[PDB]
Amino acid sequence: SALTDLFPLPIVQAPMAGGVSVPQLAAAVCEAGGLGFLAAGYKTADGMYQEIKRLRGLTGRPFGVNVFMPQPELGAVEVYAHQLAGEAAWYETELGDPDGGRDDGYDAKLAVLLDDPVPVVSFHFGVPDREVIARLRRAGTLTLVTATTPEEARAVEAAGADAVIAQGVEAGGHQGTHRDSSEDDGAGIGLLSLLAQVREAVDIPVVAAGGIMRGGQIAAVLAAGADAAQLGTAFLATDESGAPGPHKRALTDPLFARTRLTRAFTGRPARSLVNRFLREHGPYAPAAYPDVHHLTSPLRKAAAKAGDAQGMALYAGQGHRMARELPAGRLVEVLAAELAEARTALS
Amino acid sequence: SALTDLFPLPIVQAPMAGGVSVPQLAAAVCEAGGLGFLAAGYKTADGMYQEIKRLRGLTGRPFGVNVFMPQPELGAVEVYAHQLAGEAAWYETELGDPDGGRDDGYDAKLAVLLDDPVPVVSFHFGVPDREVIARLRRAGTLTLVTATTPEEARAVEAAGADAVIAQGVEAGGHQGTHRDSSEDDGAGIGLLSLLAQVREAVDIPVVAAGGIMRGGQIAAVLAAGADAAQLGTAFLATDESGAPGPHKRALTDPLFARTRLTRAFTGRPARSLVNRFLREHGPYAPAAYPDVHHLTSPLRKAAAKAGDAQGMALYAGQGHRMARELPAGRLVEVLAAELAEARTALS
Ligand SMILES: Cc1cc2nc3c(=O)[nH]c(=O)nc-3n(C[C@H](O)[C@H](O)[C@H](O)COP(=O)(O)O)c2cc1C
Ligand SMILES: Cc1cc2nc3c(=O)[nH]c(=O)nc-3n(C[C@H](O)[C@H](O)[C@H](O)COP(=O)(O)O)c2cc1C
């Protein structure tokens, strides 16, 4: 409730890196009664700060900022790089440096978030030290962390976080596993099942994420114990979304009818529409994040520049085909109406 | 509604072959207001008939009977059989004949179901010819068919079935795919997402299946458009369930903390608790059903006889750890109370 008391509708716009969730998206969601989110992933502490300032100028409503947890360091990357030689030659460029930073400006970003507190902060790819959570709490910032299993959820709670984001296997983008291993492959838990398990494993509020595209699904997760629903793909296709045109188009394109979890683009499991890049490199992508992400960055930028969807990281949840293209503000009101209608029906 | 009008509670006990859903289980579910189910899979038309008679003597309430669709015929089986040589030697037996029937007494079973109509009949592993559905309808029998994608659901509707069972990836036992192929691997759709897609693809009632263990999850699927919820694993652990003791125990045993889809036991994707047999033969199991099932039958019977869970097909959904051991009748009333409580909360 401490979370749901911040905004009127149980709808959260998921932070989406790669220039997807720009300030204008968050603002439209915020102004419509939902919780807009900025994505600090892959940006510099300064870049993130500029968006925060920008957004404050667009809305006075509560919003969130998401940060990536630093990843532990460490021949597999060399082999994969070799297999990408053809991609480099084709897009006429060179692979990025796989040994770049792995902290993603964590320290600097926390410094910014503590020096000028924002309403909400979420973390992905792990759990912050409980000291980070305590300091943010004292600053008046609510904290959220993603969990993909009841065990990870317990870790989130034990750290003192205000709420846990239960991200099911249907979710688009990166799976928020706290540690990536070949064992996670084929072990993903369906949201409806994960939510029930998490709801019984912890006592803190739960935000449900994964495949939510309609108001009735929001009603569904609330009925199963969630305090709110977090939607990424549904907002990815809205007008304020900064996602590339080829990306927004792929979502409802019959030729991109299926999605699959893959490490091809970044070295960590992420759900993307199946395309050429995924089919050819998916089976061989090693578990090396963010090493692989650095490596393929030039390839993806080149592909995007050319408008070639077959070479881009088309992150999307299993509900992508139900995506709707319209202002984010209108999407929220539509979702709200569907929610109301579903509530009424269930009574 | 034609379906939900047959019984008071939106709860369906999934048919479970292998001696799991015996007449006493179905009866307890029926008498508690739900829809009990008998499983005709792997049985003879006569065997199925005896259970039908038995059940009628235990309850006058509506119940269902499930039948397997005949599978198309067709060196991979020879290789797998070779890899099982050690299992045969250990359990001191011989592998079964992989070239046994593939129809599973379909014709004879339909003859029985048409000569002495039952309230409900469901089909698994495909869609019956529309003539079979029409004749059963004329006999006064409602028909259900499982679908794992919006496309399969459309096929179910086009065939004239009364309702489609949307079985999500979390479901225990066999995935009801109409055709099995290596491509289905890693393509499973989370129930919450599948349900929304199916609800919008067809106009007939939808029965949601997969990972449902609590009343709140039943409320969740109803809110998302389902007319009822079908539960297998939840009833697998009840006292009336005929599942082996080692099987019921594994469900909540920490040593069997995870489930995975595998072809190891039958040649078709089925979700089972991870065990020795699965770890060793899963990666090599070919797509050959029911050939592989015939082949491993002696191995599984021997394992069950010895009470060795590591060599049994421990079918179970991702919610297995939430299984409760008590009379099926009491489980239904508990689920009903949880459902009511969830409805109230959502209002
Ligand atoms: C475009 C793409 C980018 C994403 N980027 C982030 C991110 O930067 N940080 C994060 O915590 N989650 C990210 N997510 C995951 C979302 O938080 C959420 O779990 C997911 O979008 C839920 O599924 P649908 O996408 O709602 O099915 C991303 C998802 C997609 C769709
Ligand atoms: C013990 C085991 C045996 C099953 N046998 C059958 C069967 O014979 N016919 C059928 O249509 N479905 C069968 N199912 C699948 C169920 O119809 C249902 O989809 C599944 O149980 C739903 O998941 P939970 O098991 O509810 O998570 C079986 C499932 C399990 C648990």
TrEMBL record, chains A, B:
State its role.
Answer: Nitronate monooxygenase that uses molecular oxygen to catalyze the oxidative denitrification of alkyl nitronates. Acts on propionate 3-nitronate (P3N), the presumed physiological substrate. Probably functions in the detoxification of P3N, a metabolic poison produced by plants and fungi as a defense mechanism.
Q: Which GO terms describe its molecular function?
A: dioxygenase activity; nitronate monooxygenase activity; nucleotide binding
Q: What are the required cofactors?
A: FMN
The positions annotated for binding FMN are 17, 66, 167, 172, 211, 230, 232-233
Gene responsible for this protein: 2-npdl
Organism listed in the record: Streptomyces ansochromogenes
Name the reaction it catalyses: 3 propionate 3-nitronate + 3 O2 + H2O = 3 3-oxopropanoate + 2 nitrate + nitrite + H2O2 + 3 H(+)
Q: Name one GO biological process term.
A: response to toxic substance
Q: Which UniProt keywords apply?
A: Detoxification, Dioxygenase, Flavoprotein, FMN, Monooxygenase, Nucleotide-binding, Oxidoreductase
Q: Which CDD domains match?
A: NPD_like (cd04730)
Q: Name the protein family.
A: Belongs to the nitronate monooxygenase family. NMO class I subfamily.
**Per UniProt, what is one Pfam family of this protein?**
NMO
What does the organism's lineage look like at the top?
Bacteria, Bacillati, Actinomycetota, Actinomycetes, Kitasatosporales
Write down what this protein is called.
Answer: Probable nitronate monooxygenase
Note the InterPro entries from the entry: Aldolase_TIM (IPR013785), NMO (IPR004136)
